Structure 1
Amino acid sequence: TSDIQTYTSINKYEVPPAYSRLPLTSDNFDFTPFNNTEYSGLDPDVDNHYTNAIIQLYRFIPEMFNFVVGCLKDENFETTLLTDLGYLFDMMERSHGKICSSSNFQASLKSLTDKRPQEHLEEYLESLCIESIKRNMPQKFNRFLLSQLIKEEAQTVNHNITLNQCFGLETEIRTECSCDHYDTTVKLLPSLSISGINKTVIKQLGQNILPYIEYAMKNVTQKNSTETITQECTVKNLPSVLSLELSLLDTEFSNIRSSKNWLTSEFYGSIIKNKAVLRSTASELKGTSHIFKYELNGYVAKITDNNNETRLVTYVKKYNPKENCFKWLMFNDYLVVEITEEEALKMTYPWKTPEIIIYCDAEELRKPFFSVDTYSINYDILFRDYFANGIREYKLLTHDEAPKSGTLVAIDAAFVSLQSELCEIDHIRPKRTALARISIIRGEEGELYGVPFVDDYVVNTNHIEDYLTRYSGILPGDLDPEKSTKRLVRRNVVYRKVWLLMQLGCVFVGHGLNNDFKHININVPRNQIRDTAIYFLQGKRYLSLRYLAYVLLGMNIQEGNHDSIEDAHTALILYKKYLHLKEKAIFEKVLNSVYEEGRAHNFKVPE
């Protein structure tokens, strides 16, 4: 419990506590003993054992980070995986340690794998079991993500090419079918797979990682199919970053452990011939034309437990602009601890093998990370309508209603149940719940007060198991064509509406909204929210909303199918009642009125 952020043990065989199976989070779980850094970690309550480590590997690429968050200025709804990654990236940067969930992104991943070298998606739709990770499944996802990001990067607004320009490896595929006759394809590949290697020089110059990259960039094999065709692969490109998918054998995997300093912090290299080998900045360059220097930016290692469980962790380097320095971080699921370079590169530990190494251009690893509000954003969907249904007495916004930093308006959202506890395997944990409706009403004092402006039902094609409108207000017609007299729209657009609001600094009021933000998968700052459940709180025993609608003023909002519209309305005018009682000196004089009167009334009065 106490010393779990210890990331080393004196025995090469004992796995340090920082690398082992964290306790499940499944209710006010306090994360401060697990992360003292200003860099958030990710909630492990997801379907995928492996993607968590990879997202962290990617968040600290300055060049890919700055792009994925960058495209959030514009409204890119159809490219689900890239803008949801952007919402996640923007989330992690601003939480500054606060726990993050990748739930939204994981839903978009499973969304497109369930849609149809198509064999990539089918294999990656092992979202369902996840021995918790199998061999080469991380590298399979590293390729899948980079591939399906670049495909989506062509469908932006003002279509950009940036990710290809840095993960683009021009692979010449020359298949010598006959003699004096060879066919060649040239494919742009996002990652470089170091896989399936035969008897290979590993001993002489020396035992470092560099030759392994060399073979994967210049090699031609004598195995195919009744022909046994021999085929040529070489890359005429040294891109800004190099995502290496390491995939070896366990025999080859413990020899590499014993060669000390097997990785390389920084390497330099160019292409002299149409082959490619790089030196160790030992200036062994036989000829010279444009030179490139690469430092290691991060990598994802697989941890085999002392109890023989498996997880993935992420080592990362980040440069500081106030002083020339490299800080190295390791990311267990929500365990984030700052460690020294020496321990971050060491591979002598048998329980640790590398799976996805990435190298990055030196001059642009030392490039800063830029917020999305470094740019200026399209806020249009706040003042427009984007409905996917045929088609709620609400009125839309007007440009004189430009929400500024501090606009107090009320929010309430409802969700539905898809999969239950699904537990007792290691107690497995409750996983699935998806949101369906969300309403934001005007709470700025004026002619337009208490008036809703967004009341949007969310599309959902997935299987519903419990609808439960005694608490949700969802008519079963939550599928896109058969609109339940409702304005159904995609999940991505109304996330943007909420995101834009907290991004500029609106103040949200409502009842237990941190729970609501947990389900819409967003993090609002502590000071940008007025929770009536926290204001009228007596240390415990969170009071109802129907009770206080009845016991603090005259409405009776109980026993009706909960209508997100008016529960946000009820929450709005209560935060104003809390304000009249706080401006006067009767705060606790009125606080002790009703939970004293409710204890003799069992906290439930006639409706």
Structure 2
Amino acid sequence: SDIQTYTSINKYEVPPAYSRLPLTSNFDFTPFNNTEYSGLDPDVDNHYTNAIIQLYRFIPEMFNFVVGCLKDENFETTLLTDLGYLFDMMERSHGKICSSSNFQASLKSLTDKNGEPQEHLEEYLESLCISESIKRNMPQKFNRFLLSQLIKEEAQTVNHNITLNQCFGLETEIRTECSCDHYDTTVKLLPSLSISGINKTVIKQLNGQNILPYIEYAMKNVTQKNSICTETITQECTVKNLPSVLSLELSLLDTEFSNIRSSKNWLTSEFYGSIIKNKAVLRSTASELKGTSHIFKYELNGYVAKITDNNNETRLVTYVKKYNPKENCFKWLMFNDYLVVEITEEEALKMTYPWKTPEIIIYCDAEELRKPFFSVDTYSINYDILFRDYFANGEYKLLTHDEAPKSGTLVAIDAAFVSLQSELCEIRPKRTALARISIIRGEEGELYGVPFVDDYVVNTNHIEDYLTRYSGILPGDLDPEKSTKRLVRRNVVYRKVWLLMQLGCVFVGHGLNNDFKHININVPRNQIRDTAIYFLQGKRYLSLRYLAYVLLGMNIQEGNHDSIEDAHTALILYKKYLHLKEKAIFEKVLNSVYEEGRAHNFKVP
């Protein structure tokens, strides 16, 4: 049938839900997602991060934490709070399309950077310019990188937490035996387990057989291949921990990958396990244990599979288990970039298909998966940033405590942008960065129409054009080379908009739906008052400089578009439209501009 079918009769034909989906480059997403859980825009420089972000949104322990860090202002930790801004955005849209553009810009900016795993970061700066879709072991490499970087940034949060280490941390002993009766070991906390090098699979005879032997080997193994100065060291790795969440990375040979596809029920639904020997022993039933210890039960949370096409293209998809608490139930979800379909367990766990390869598996503690997902609004969020002045360099009044916005407060917003990279298609148009935004006090009172933020956002990447005939962004957007502008990072100015959307305030402006897509934030419809939808006659949207001239008596004098002037005129236009609707004169004057503007060509100076 149509694209949301996730099973075809032949084991060889790839279903439509797993195929290549049309480029989105206003696109309509309603035939691609029926459920209340969002998908992600595929216009991204990473062919693979979208599948991983979805896998992590649905671990209650990690979702609740990184969303949790959105209480306090964590500006220095970009990747962790941008993941939080994304996670919170995905949760509240409840199905609407989401874009990871903000997060993806943090990842590229941080990747641009004595230390041994600096080759970790070179791998992505290498892979953010693309020629195939995804190469070998690259999903697994990001899984470890992202977890590592989050843990590193998690240490530098407010009220520094170790929470991500408690769930992911694997205490790994590396005993390296040089000579007889003499060995040296190191111990490091590793966020994920890597099933990388396998010599002979005695793990398929009677222990084919399921995944648990493979997990056990990577948990304690000895191998005798190295070099020193012509030594060929024998190394012994062993984990002495069974943490709350278990991040697996699978990279075997294609011969080991086609033999694995016939041992049915290989990828195991649930298993218990503990540490009795100095090795970890995990079995299927709990009575297959000798006791010996505290018993840990693990259920599968989700995993990231690699799809290889009938046209020999590749992409990543995400399987996810979500627990609804009203019923003792599990909703199995499959995620293709913006394709989200609810599947059942027998199809989610199956790997009989040759076009399917597991690459990242996640196991969660059974008691911890049924923990509910908590929005950031269950906490008390720090709103200081709307009242404080915070600039990063050398016309508007900031707000009071009596000006504390509530659910329904009127504010006017306008945003200006510059272009980093143009279309570059064979690919799709990718880059355009935020330059300046302004908010306006929209509530009727003594301070009405007066702005309270005017923030030019710093950006170091080379921009292709300033668009100043449309944006008015004088080339003083450099960090120390402010023309006279008051500059702020992107994470702080996003926090200002996010807090306004957090309280439930109401935004007025022209083309707000567009600006919010480039702010990378999703406002609900009740909180938008777009003059675009009000003063519209089918197609051919009217110029705001025109509406300022024909709906009231202002000559906008359109030189370089002033963000704050635009935000101000849009505010009083929404009030003029409101007055024209207070009595029945709305649709009448709606056509006064339609018929008498054609003789004026919709432009008069």
Identify the TM-score tier after normalising by the shorter chain: over 0.9
SS in 1 for 2:307: strand
What is the distance in 1 between the residues matched to 2:481 and 2:297? 57
Deviation at 1:564, TM superposition (A): 0.3
8 Å contact 1:413–1:564 — kept in the other structure?
A: yes
Whole-Å separation in 2 of the counterparts to 1:529 and 1:362: 41
Could you report, residue by residue, the CA deviation over 1:128-170 in whole angstroms, capped at 9, with x for unpaired residues? 3331000000000000000000000000011000000000000
User: For 1:594, what is the secondary structure of its paired residue?
Assistant: helix
The 5 Å alignment of 1:67-78 reads 67-78=65-76
- Secondary structure of 1:177's counterpart equals strand
SS in 1 for 2:31: coil
Deviations 1:425-469 (A, max 9, x none): xxx000000001000010100000000000000010001111121
Deviations 1:54-108 (A, max 9, x none): 0000000000000000000000000000000000000000000000000000000
Q: Distance in 1 between matches of 2:559 and 2:575?
A: 24
Query: 1:159-210 CA distances to partner (integer Å, 9 max, x unpaired)?
Result: 0000000000000011011111111100000000000211121332261000
Per-residue deviation, residues 374-411 of structure 1 (Å, max 9, x unmatched): 00000001000110010xx0000110001000001100
1:575-599 deviations in Å (ceiling 9; x for gaps) = 0000110001101001001021111
Q: Is the 8 A contact 1:110 1:127 kept in 2?
A: no
Q: Which residue of 2 aligns with 1:204?
A: 205
Residue 9 of structure 1 is matched in structure 2 by 8
Q: Distance in 2 between matches of 1:516 and 1:117?
A: 39
Aligned length: 599
**Whole-angstrom CA distance in 2 between matches of 1:433 and 1:313:** 27
1:30 aligned partner: 28
SS in structure 1 of the partner of residue 580 of structure 2: helix
3-state DSSP of counterpart to 1:497: helix
TM-score by length of 1: 0.98
Aligned 8 A contact 1:211 1:277 in 2? no
Tell me, yes or no, if the aligned pair for 2:320 and 2:334 is still in contact at 8 Å: yes
Q: Which residue does the alignment assign to 2:263?
A: 259
Corresponding residue SS for 2:417: strand
TM-superposed deviation, 1:282:
5.4
Q: Which runs of 5+ in 2 are unaligned?
A: none
- Residue of 279, 287, 292 corresponding to 2:283: 279
Structure 2 CA distance for aligned equivalents of residues 578 and 203 of structure 1: 72
> Which of 344-353 and 111-120 deviates more?
111-120
Quote the offset at 1:284 in angstroms: 1.6
SS in 2 for 1:500: helix
Establish whether residue 82 from structure 1 lines up as the match of residue 80 from structure 2.
yes
| 2:126 maps to 1:134 | no
- Tell me, which stretches of 5 or more residues in structure 1 are unaligned? none
- Range with bigger deviation, 398-407 or 536-545: 536-545
Q: Is the 8 A contact 2:67 2:87 kept in 1?
A: yes
TM-superposed CA distance for 1:605, in Å, is: 1.1
Q: CA deviation at 1:354?
A: 0.2
The 8 Å contact of residues 417 and 467 in structure 2, kept in 1 or not, is answered as no
1:239 has 2:243 as partner: yes
SS at match of 1:99: coil
Q: How does 1:39-188 map to 2 (within 5 A)?
A: 39-115=37-113, 117-130=117-130, 131-188=132-189
Tell me the alpha carbon deviations over residues 276-320 of structure 1, each in whole angstroms, 9 at most, x when there is no partner. 120012522134210000000000000001101100000000011
Tell me if 1:429 matches 2:428.
yes
Deviation string, structure 1 residues 254-291 (Cα, Å, up to 9, x no partner): 00001011110000010101011200125221342100
Shift of 1:117: 1.1
* Partners of 2:177 and 2:235 within 8 A in 1: yes
Structure 1 distance, partners of 2:389, 2:222, is 56
Q: Distance in 2 between matches of 1:293 and 1:478?
A: 54
Instruction: Classify the secondary structure of the residue corresponding to 1:301.
Output: strand
What do residues 332-381 of structure 1 show as CA deviations (whole Å, max 9, x unaligned)? 00000000100000000000000000000000101100010100000001
Instruction: Calculate the TM-score normalised by the size of structure 2.
Output: 0.98
Q: CA deviation at 1:501?
A: 0.4
Map 1:404-553 → 2, pairs under 5 A: 404-424=406-426, 428-553=427-552
In the alignment, the residues of structure 1 paired with residue 290 and residue 380 of structure 2 have an alpha-carbon distance, to the nearest angstrom, of 48
Contact 2:414 2:437 in 1 (8 A): yes
95-104 vs 547-556, greater mean Cα deviation:
547-556
Structure 2 CA distance, aligned partners of 1:395 and 1:230? 68
Decide whether the 8 Å contact of 1:315 with 1:328 is kept in 2: yes
CA-CA distance at 1:600 after TM superposition? 1.8
Indicate if the aligned counterparts of 1:74 and 1:157 stay in contact, CA closer than 8 A: yes
C-alpha separation in 2, matches of 1:495 and 1:559: 28
Identity %: 100
Q: SS state of the match for residue 596, structure 1? A: helix
1:470-500 Cα offsets, whole Å, 9 max, x none, are: 1001010101111120001100001000000
Using the TM superposition, name which of 516-525 and 281-290 deviates more: 281-290
Contact 1:46–1:103, Cα closer than 8 Å, also in 2: yes
Closer, same or farther: CA 127–601 of 1 in aligned 2, 3 Å = farther
Q: CA deviation at 1:423?
A: 0.4
SS in structure 1 of the partner of residue 470 of structure 2? coil
**Aligned 8 A contact 2:192 2:247 in 1:** yes
Distance (whole Å) between structure 2 residues aligned to residue 52 and residue 285 of structure 1: 39
2:187 and 2:430 mapped to 1: Cα distance? Answer: 43
Secondary structure of residue in 2 paired with 1:117: helix
Q: CA deviation at 1:602?
A: 1.1
Is contact 1:124–1:140 with CA below 8 Å preserved after alignment? no
Q: For residues 69 and 556 of structure 1, what CA distance do their matches in structure 2 show?
A: 46
Query: Partners in 2 of 1:128 and 1:84 — Cα distance?
Result: 18
C-alpha distance in structure 1 between counterparts of 2:287 and 2:313, whole Å: 43
Q: Could you report, residue by residue, the CA deviation over 1:489-543 in whole angstroms, capped at 9, with x for unpaired residues?
A: 1000010000000111000000010100001100000111100011001111111
What is the distance in 1 between the residues matched to 2:233 and 2:566? 69
Give the Cα–Cα distance (whole angstroms) in 1 for the partners of residues 283 and 347 of structure 2.
24
Maintained 8 Å contact 2:412/2:568: yes
Does the 8 Å contact 2:195/2:214 carry over to 1?
yes
Q: Deviations over 1:239-267 (max 9, x none)?
A: 00000000101010000001011110000
SS at match of 1:463: coil
1:84 aligns to what SS in structure 2? helix
> How many angstroms apart in 1 are the aligned matches of 2:343 and 2:24?
25
